[PDB]
Amino acid sequence: TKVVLGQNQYGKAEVRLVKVTRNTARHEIQDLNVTSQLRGDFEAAHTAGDNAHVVATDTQKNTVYAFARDGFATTEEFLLRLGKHFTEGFDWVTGGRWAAQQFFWDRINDHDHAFSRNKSEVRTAVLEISGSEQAIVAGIEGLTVLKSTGSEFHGFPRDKYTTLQETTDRILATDVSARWRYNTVEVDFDAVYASVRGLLLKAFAETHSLALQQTMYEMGRAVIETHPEIDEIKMSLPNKHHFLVDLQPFGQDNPNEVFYAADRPYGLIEATIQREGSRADHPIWSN
Amino acid sequence: TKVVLGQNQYGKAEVRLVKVTRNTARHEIQDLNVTSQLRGDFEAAHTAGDNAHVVATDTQKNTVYAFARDGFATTEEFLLRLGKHFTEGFDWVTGGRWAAQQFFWDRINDHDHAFSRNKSEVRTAVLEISGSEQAIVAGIEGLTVLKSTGSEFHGFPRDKYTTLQETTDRILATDVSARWRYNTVEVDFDAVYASVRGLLLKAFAETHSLALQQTMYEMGRAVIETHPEIDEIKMSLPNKHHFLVDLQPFGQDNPNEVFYAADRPYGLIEATIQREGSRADHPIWSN
Amino acid sequence: TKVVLGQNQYGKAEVRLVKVTRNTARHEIQDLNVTSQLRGDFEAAHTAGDNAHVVATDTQKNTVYAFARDGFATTEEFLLRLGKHFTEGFDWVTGGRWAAQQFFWDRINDHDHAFSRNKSEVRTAVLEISGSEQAIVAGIEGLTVLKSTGSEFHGFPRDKYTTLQETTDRILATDVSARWRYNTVEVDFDAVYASVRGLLLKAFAETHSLALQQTMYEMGRAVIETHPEIDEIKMSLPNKHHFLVDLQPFGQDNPNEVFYAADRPYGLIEATIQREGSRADHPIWSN
Amino acid sequence: TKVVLGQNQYGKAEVRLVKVTRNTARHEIQDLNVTSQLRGDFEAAHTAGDNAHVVATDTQKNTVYAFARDGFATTEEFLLRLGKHFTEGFDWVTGGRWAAQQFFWDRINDHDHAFSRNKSEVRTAVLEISGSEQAIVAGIEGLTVLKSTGSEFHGFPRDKYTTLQETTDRILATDVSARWRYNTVEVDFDAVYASVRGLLLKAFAETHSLALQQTMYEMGRAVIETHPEIDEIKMSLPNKHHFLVDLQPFGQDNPNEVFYAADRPYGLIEATIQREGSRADHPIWSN
Numbered sequence A, B, C, D: 001t002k003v004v005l006g007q008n009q010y011g012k013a014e015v016r017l018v019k020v021t022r023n024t025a026r027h028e029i030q031d032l033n034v035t036s037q038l039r040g041d042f043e044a045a046h047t048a049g050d051n052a053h054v055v056a057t058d059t060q061k062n063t064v065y066a067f068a069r070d071g072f073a074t075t076e077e078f079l080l081r082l083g084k085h086f087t088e089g090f091d092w093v094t095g096g097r098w099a100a101q102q103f104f105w106d107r108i109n110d111h112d113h114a115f116s117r118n119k120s121e122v123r124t125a126v127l128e129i130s131g132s133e134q135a136i137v138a139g140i141e142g143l144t145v146l147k148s149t150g151s152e153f154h155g156f157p158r159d160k161y162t163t164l165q166e167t168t169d170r171i172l173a174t175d176v177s178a179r180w181r182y183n184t185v186e187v188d189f190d191a192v193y194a195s196v197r198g199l200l201l202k203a204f205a206e207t208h209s210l211a212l213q214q215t216m217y218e219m220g221r222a223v224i225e226t227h228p229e230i231d232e233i234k235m236s237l238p239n240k241h242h243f244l245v246d247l248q249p250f251g252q253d254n255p256n257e258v259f260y261a262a263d264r265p266y267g268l269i270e271a272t273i274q275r276e277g278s279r280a281d282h283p284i285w286s287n
């Protein structure tokens, strides 16, 4: 009967940007996929078609490239400039969400302006501004890792639908997807990302696993303990199954050597590892 | 300081199920992509690696196939059965999230047991249980639509970054991605899905659009006004830009006929249309 | 010692074109993904960097839109016009390959200028010109089909590595990818495409299958037998495995009802069905 | 006219294999995506549904895992064993096509049994046996490269549809996809792959490009000149357009710094660089 406009946001999504730094003969590359969305009073825009407040998505796009011209130290700095620009520049704009993916490049044999793409991981950054407060969630994804041993899984409940055999030696493979919320913008974003990444890899590799849930916890723990600027870290880890193939039918044995890597289904272990006391329901996770 | 385990869930994702109903010569096909994750007391599993509370992801998988044997009338019904089984079947399991995608099939010339997949859209359903609380969200996705005319965009702000030219005749294309929350479990899930689908399509086509935002408001308004069982509908619509090519350099005009369909970037207009007085932020939207 | 430039071709790939026909209120849509590549004398371009013979890929792109202004009856007519233009327009250009994917759209409730995308199949066309001769291969792909019964596979040899069990009732699912070469350009492209599509569906559905190889064969024979303008048809059909799940461990039987749809690996059955006495090594299949 | 069965092949595609070598504490990882198809007399299987000659695809799959148990020095060596097995093992099987994608892994901090995926490239191998002949084509793909300068494109023809402007400084970006055919199986497969790779990257980075065509020619020539065992190298290089954004409308210049990385369309420059007098139509290039 009575309809009302609820939460809403709009902008330009996936603006691919490449910024070359060449004031010297030693060129640098910054490759981003930027998304800009504004929040505020767009009541008339939706219910009436009154675009008076609608800052064109096309215009948000231009702004991205226009700002890019000036250069940026980090992806987070670039995003902070955009968010500040749209919120302060417009009355009806009370905040928004600004995200970006960062793609890495490696010099080809230390060449000054020749590079090859490093596709082993993708860095993420998300800025959400709400009136007077703002927040930044950095992250990493697409980083596949695997232990060929040093992992077991047993002691789990056995109901009438349970057929999984316990084991003390299996492969543990997953795709590292983690995002951590900063409790301050005053952060050396590049140094932290590098450190967090190292901590994640280290924890995953050195922890004798009794379960993916356990490994993820240790991973989240190493980060929280190391960076005070980080309140919480959320991770989503798929248990990419590697089934030890049965070779007895062929007169052979399989001493944990030959595996079949199945695509689907896969186990999905997810959890938030937070700092005691820190918030437990930040609006930035609402997306 | 002190590290703590916050929110967390685990289970089996993307279990591909195909249920054939063949008690009669007229076979029926049900195609699903099912994901099952449990919520509860998994503290020890994460902190100490004690899996006494860890119902194997493999077991959740086996349960889906086992329960499929008995058949099911609707996707939502199927998910409801799994949710209650796990929550009730284990005391440390206080809830969870069970979602699925439903893929459609059409008979090959009305053949009794020969079909071809209809890929024009994908139906979704998500069930979330929190103690005694049960919430279901159904939706549609991958349904691309386009208006060759009956769409305009003008009256928007113009700053030093605005280049977009006002227009009273342009193409409006998008991928319909919608999800609505049911306020009751007693719903004719299939009838309502078809209805809502028709309402979204009808509103998209018939509304003389003055902005994607307006078309979306009308699409949702139609849904709420028609279905008492729905408290809100969320839509994420990309403005898939079709650029009218400039052929004047070659001496030809382009009477809104020849277009270049860009991939990225694209505008992304999102909004929530709800029944007045309905809950503002149900937890199911957090996932 | 002596390095040589062999086969080569270049151009613009994936030019997304949308042509709206609106001489009346009843609008029509033509959606294409065009790829144009030229062949001829480009020796100097590769060996010396002399671009005098290089009709820019950008130019080929502009040419697609420019020609699009005049409209076209079919996708094949459009490709024929392009190839002709590039081969006759440039002395050193002696040939090329012009391909296109055609995307289908359906009217939203018979609306005059609002449509929804039909993603159940994709039509393709390829034109190859070599000197004074030209050949056209049309096709369909992405059309997924499945028989819930009417399929068996037994009588295969057995060796020490064989474990597959015989069957007289299984699911037979595949993705229809078919490409047929015309032996003349004087063809009703649209009607033949609709016909072939129909013949492939009917043969797949009605043939009681003793193997995917046998089914694919009947599908090809029907095409060759029905259309004189077709010298040969090639098909690539994956055997999309649907494993009848073993429910015995859970105290249940599975009367051919519950299946697991595995992604990989999959059987891949391919063959060429030709008219007796027709070329078997046509260049168009090489590229 | 009468219908006939032309060229044909069948087998199991994309069998995902992971071979862990753990005779010592220093584990090794081989990760492949294998496809095996057979060629020979399968007339009866297609025309009659007589499967006596049909070595089950499931069986081909089993053989892959069984052979993997014995380990293999290289991907090529692995395909050769499979190929000889099926051709020599069955009188009616006269040949076939075996292919594989090899995925790379790097140790985590030189850890003995923990690794992370190097997704920056994918190695490929294809074996085709025709009687006693064994043809091997090795290749690389997914290797994205870019030059921020040292690339120009001018001197091209300006026909009635040419608007592209001449330039002496632009970004040159592509996805290195290359495949080279060995004239002998007596090859240190791993060493040549590393060399070839090095050669392709070097020629790309170090050549002052006057056109993608020129760059590609030098890449291929360096390979043909360096390795006597390679008869030819084919390359398919997309010109991934990075458009220098026009910021003048915003009162700023853009000294080759701010770019827009467009997805489609894109230039596609392909060519074959061979040893003078070598075969130019090897069957292996048709699949």
Ligand SMILES: O=c1[nH]c(=O)c2nn[nH]c2[nH]1
Residues within 6 Å of the ligand: A153, A164, A210, A211, A212, A213, A239, A267, A269, B010, B011, B054, B055, B056, B057, B058
């Ligand atoms: O690490 C694991 N966690 C789980 O929850 C699980 N279920 N099956 N195997 C498993 N492995």
Ligand SMILES: O=c1[nH]c(=O)c2nn[nH]c2[nH]1
Residues within 6 Å of the ligand: A010, A054, A055, A056, A057, A058, B153, B164, B210, B211, B212, B213, B239, B267, B269
């Ligand atoms: O419908 C539209 N809404 C927007 O917000 C927008 N921005 N540019 N074009 C647009 N079109």
Ligand SMILES: O=c1[nH]c(=O)c2nn[nH]c2[nH]1
Residues within 6 Å of the ligand: C010, C054, C055, C056, C057, C058, D153, D164, D210, D211, D212, D213, D239, D267, D269
């Ligand atoms: O390197 C290039 N080769 C081409 O053929 C071309 N066409 N446009 N730009 C181009 N760049």
Ligand SMILES: O=c1[nH]c(=O)c2nn[nH]c2[nH]1
Residues within 6 Å of the ligand: C153, C164, C210, C211, C212, C213, C239, C267, C269, D010, D011, D054, D055, D056, D057, D058, D059
């Ligand atoms: O139809 C089939 N064809 C084959 O070649 C095969 N191999 N295993 N199962 C099979 N089924």
